[PDB]
Amino acid sequence: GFIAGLVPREKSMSFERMLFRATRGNVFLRQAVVDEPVVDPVSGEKMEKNVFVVFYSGERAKNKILKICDAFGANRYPFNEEFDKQAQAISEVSGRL
Amino acid sequence: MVRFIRQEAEEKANEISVSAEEEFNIEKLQLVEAEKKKIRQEYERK
Amino acid sequence: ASRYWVVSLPVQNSAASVWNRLQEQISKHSFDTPLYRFNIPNLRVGTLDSLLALSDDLVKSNSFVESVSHKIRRQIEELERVSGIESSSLSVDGVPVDTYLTRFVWDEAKYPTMSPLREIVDGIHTLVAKIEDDLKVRVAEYNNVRSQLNAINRKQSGSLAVRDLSNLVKLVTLLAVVPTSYVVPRSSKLLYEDLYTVTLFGRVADNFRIAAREKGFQIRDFEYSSEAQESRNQELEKLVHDQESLRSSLLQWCYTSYGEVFSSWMHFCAVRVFAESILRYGLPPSFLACVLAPSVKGEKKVRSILEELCG
C-alpha cells in the first residue's frame, strides 16, 4: 500500500509515538527538512511542518495512518509514482500560488 | 516480511487461477456429459 | 477475575534475555515468576489483512474480555456458589491457569480455525459471540429464579397481614383479631391461633362483626381458602427448587461458562500476542513469549529483562 502524506517536524514525536505497532519496524517515514515553516493548506500564516512518506501494510493500519496524517494538518500532497511528475506538479503549484 | 506478504498475495491470485482451472475442468466434464447425452439423443432419434 | 497479564514478547526477543530462556531459566524466573507459555503456529503465514483486523479488533477484544469478566463475577456473586471453581477446577486448556498459558494445544482447529490469522480472528469473534449467549442465558435464568423465589414464601407465617390461611382455625371467618353476648351461640372459640379468637357465631352477623372488626382488635387479612395457603406452600417449594437450581446447577453452568470465557480470553490474548510478534518480528506464526501473574516488582523485573523489545 501507499501511505504518501506529511508528518509535521514539530509533531514528529507524536507521529512516531502513535501507531508504533502499525509501522512494524519495516515502515520508515522520510520526513522533510522543514527548515522554513511550510505553508499550511488552509493557513497562510504557515507552520513548521514537514512532509514524510511511509509504507502502508494492512487495510486498518493504512486507514489509521491516513487519519493520523489528516489530523496532523501538515502540508501534504499526493505523491506520484514518478518523481518527475511530482516535481512538475510542485512547479505548477508554485507558479499558480 | 513485506516481500513475503506480496508473494502471499501473488500466490492467492495463482490459487484463484487454479481454482478457476479446476472449476473449468469440472464444467468441461459436465458439458461433455451433456454432449454425450445429446449424442445419445440424436443417435437414438436417428 | 484476572485481567490480561501477558507481556507482548516476540519470538526473537522473548520475555527473558534469550528466546529459549523464556520457557525455563528466565531472568524473570529468577524472581520466582511462573511465566511459561507457547503458541501453536498457524497453517499458513497470516497476511497484512490479519494484522489490520487484529489492530482494529483490539478494542472489540477488550470489550469482550470486560463482558466475560463482568458476567463471570456476577454469576459467581449472585448464585453465591459458582465461586468454588479454581484455576485447576476451571481447567482452561485442560490445565490450571498457570499451566493453561503454557498449554497451546487449544490453538488447534477445534476452537480456532487453524487457518491463516485472518480466519483466526473471525474464529475468535465467533467464539466471543457464542460466549455472549452464556451471559444471556445466565441473565434469563437469574430473572426467572428471582421471579420464582420472590413469588412465594415471601408472605407471613399465618395469623398476620398475609398468608394467614395457613394458621386458620380449619359461621366463622378468618379474622385473627390481634390487639359478644347475644342470642347467637357465642359460646365458642375458634382455633385460629398462631393471634387469638373471640366469642362469635354466624347466626348473628352483628356478633361476628363485634368479635372481628367492629372495635378494638382488627381482623387480619388472610388467603381466601386454606387451599390457597397449601398452593402458596407448594409454590414456595417450587420457588425454592428454582432458586436452588439457579444457585447450584445454573451456578455450575456459570462456572463452566467462566472457564470457557477464560479459555477464550487466553486464545484471544495468544492471537493478540501473535499479531504483536508479527509486528515486531517475522510475519509467519512464531512466538516464544510467556504469561503469568507476578507482583508489581515482578512486572518491573520483566520490563527490565525485556527492555530490549519494548513498545
Swiss-Prot record, chain B:
Domain of life of the source: Eukaryota
Function: Subunit of the peripheral V1 complex of vacuolar ATPase essential for assembly or catalytic function. V-ATPase is responsible for acidifying a variety of intracellular compartments in eukaryotic cells.
Family: Belongs to the V-ATPase E subunit family.
Quaternary structure and partners: V-ATPase is a heteromultimeric enzyme composed of a peripheral catalytic V1 complex (components A to H) attached to an integral membrane V0 proton pore complex (components: a, c, c', c'' and d).
Name the record gives this protein: V-type proton ATPase subunit E
Annotated source species: Citrus unshiu
Gene: VATE
